Amino acid sequence: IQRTPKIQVYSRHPPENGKPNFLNCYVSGFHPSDIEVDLLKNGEKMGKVEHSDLSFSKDWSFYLLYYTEFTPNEKDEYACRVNHVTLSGPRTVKWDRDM
Amino acid sequence: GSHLEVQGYW
Amino acid sequence: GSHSMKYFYTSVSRPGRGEPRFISVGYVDDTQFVRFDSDAESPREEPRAPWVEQEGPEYWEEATRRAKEAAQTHRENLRTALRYYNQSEAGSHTIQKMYGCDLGPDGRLLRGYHQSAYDGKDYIALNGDLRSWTAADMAAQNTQRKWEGNRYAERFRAYLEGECLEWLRRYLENGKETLQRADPPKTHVTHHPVSDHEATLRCWALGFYPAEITLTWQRDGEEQTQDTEFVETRPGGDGTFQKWGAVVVPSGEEQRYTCHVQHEGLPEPLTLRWEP
């Protein structure tokens, strides 16, 4: 079948520059379950990224949360990078404090 | 336990 | 209030790399409480909620046994499916199974679940009557016949009305402070210009539990769907959930738009506006 992942990159709490927070990348609606997800800061993989146990929704589509600690600031860029069989190359979604 | 004891084979 | 206990099993074969990977996660309502992963360094049922960590050795030994048996059943089912669909052992395949019970306010079984998909498509499911199965295809009909032959529906029902409800009750009692408490969302509206003629109003709901929530936009009190975007409800990472809904509006008309939020944790539904 093959379903393309949806991706949301976002903070646990409303971001304030300099204030410790939590960076989340929620990937969902994909199939098969094989997937690669990374959290990046300024284009480089962050130091300690972990993830939830594979689970799925009503329609059988899988979802995973990848996460790490982060302290937002004006100069640094944070992003989530996903590779899946349904994606040509890796898809990268930048963290946007407005979403 | 909560885990289903009965096994449903296809 | 109504509550639920559900298990989600996923098995994925991986030819050339040994046995299929089995993952089980258990939930009470929207709270995960256990996990088992056959690829863990020492595969065993593990606590994922404080109100279950306290269970004695019996619980973990038996849950580990059952998780392993479930994995075995899934391996057998994967082989069987290769037969049913005439597929090669060299290809990877997936089985997903969810099952569980809903405890009603009266304390009796409200609803039962037992359903499975093969390679991401419906395979077989227990019907609303809790007595018959819907088979999605001819392959699943073999399974349907087998299960009619061995009274699988009845025995599962015994589980639903037996240990499923009993353990659901037990967990609800052991973790009432966290399971039976509804945390309302912290909400707000933000404004983001799209151009010199349009702007986005975004209504945020954060830190709420359980996951169920309604978030809508109105103009002059009328429901609005045109030019709206509602993201999938998403986990906070701390056991809470989040959601936002946005609408693009003509600059100057912002004060006619209201965001409406409904959640179990709220005494009254919310009516929010952009507060510059």
Q: Where are the domains of chain A?
A: 1-99
- Residues 200-219 (C) with a CB less than 8 A from some CB of B: none
Using CB atoms, list chains with 3+ pairs below 8 Å to chain C. Answer: A, B
CATH superfamily of this structure's domain A1-99: Immunoglobulins (2.60.40.10)
Q: Is there a contact between C238 and A69 (Cβ–Cβ < 8 Å)? A: no
Identify the sign of the CA torsion C87, A29, A40, C206. Answer: negative
Contacts of C146 in chain B (CB under 8 A): 9-10
Q: State whether residue A68 sits within 8 Å of chain C by CB.
A: no
The token pair that represents A45 in the structure block: 């993989």
CATH class of C182-276: mainly beta
Name the method of structure determination. Answer: X-ray
C-alpha to C-alpha distances, C35 to C4, C39, C40, C46, C66, nearest whole angstrom: 17, 12, 10, 5, 12
Give the relative orientation of helices C138-149 and C57-84 as an angle to the nearest 10 degrees.
Answer: 130
Dist CA C25 CA A56 (whole Å): 10
Q: State whether residue C94 sits within 8 Å of chain A by CB.
A: yes
Taking residue C182's Cβ as centre, other Cβ atoms within 10 Å add up to: 13
Query: Over the range C183-200, which residues count as b (16 or more CB within 10 Å of their CB) and which as e?
Result: bbbebbbbeeeeeeeebb
What DSSP state is assigned to residue A89? S
Which of A8, A44, A47 is closest to A26 using CA atoms? A8
The residues of chain C that CATH labels 2.60.40.10 are: 182-276
Which of A11, A19, A30, A1 is closest to A68 using CA atoms? A11
The token pair that represents C199 in the structure block: 């702007």
C-alpha to C-alpha distances, A52 to A22, C75, C101, C248, C252, nearest whole angstrom: 14, 24, 23, 34, 44
The residues of chain C that CATH labels 3.30.500.10 are: 1-181
Dist CA C14 CA C18 (whole Å): 7
What DSSP state is assigned to residue A31? B
Q: State whether residue C165 sits within 8 Å of chain B by CB.
A: no
The token pair that represents C192 in the structure block: 């983001």
Chains B & C: contacts with CB separation below 8 Å: 62
Give the relative orientation of helices C152-159 and C138-149 as an angle to the nearest 10 degrees.
Answer: 70
**Which residue of C62, C78, C82 is the best one to mutate when testing the B interface, meaning the one whose CB has the most B CBs within 10 A?**
C62
CATH domain C1-181 topology: 3.30.500
Spatial neighbors of A7 by CB under 8 A, at least 6 apart, are A25, A26, A27, A80, A82, A91, A93
Contacts of C160 in chain B (CB under 8 A): none
* Three-state secondary structure readout of chain C: CCEEEEEEEEEECCCCCCCCEEEEEEEECCEEEEEEECCCCCCCCEECCHHHHCCCHHHHHHHHHHHHHHHHHHHHHHHHHHHHCCCCCCCCCEEEEEEEEEECCCCCEEEEEEEEEECCEEEEEECCCCCCEEECCHHHHHHHHHHHHCCHHHHHHHHHHHHHHHHHHHHHHHCHHHHCCCECCEEEEEEEECCCCEEEEEEEEEEEECCCCEEEEEECCEEECCCEEECCCEECCCCCEEEEEEEEEECCCHHHEEEEEECCCCCCCEEECCCC
Q: Is there a contact between A53 and C39 (Cβ–Cβ < 8 Å)? A: no
Q: Please tell me the distance in Å from B1's CA to the nearest CA on chain C.
A: 6
DSSP-derived pairing of the beta strands C186-193 and C198-208: antiparallel
Contacts of C124 in chain B (CB under 8 A): 10
Contact: chain C with chain A (3+ CB pairs below 8 Å): yes
Q: State whether residue A67 sits within 8 Å of chain C by CB.
A: yes
Resolution (A): 2.0
Dist CA C46 CA C43 (whole Å): 9
Q: Please tell me the distance in Å from C21's CA to the nearest CA on chain A.
A: 11
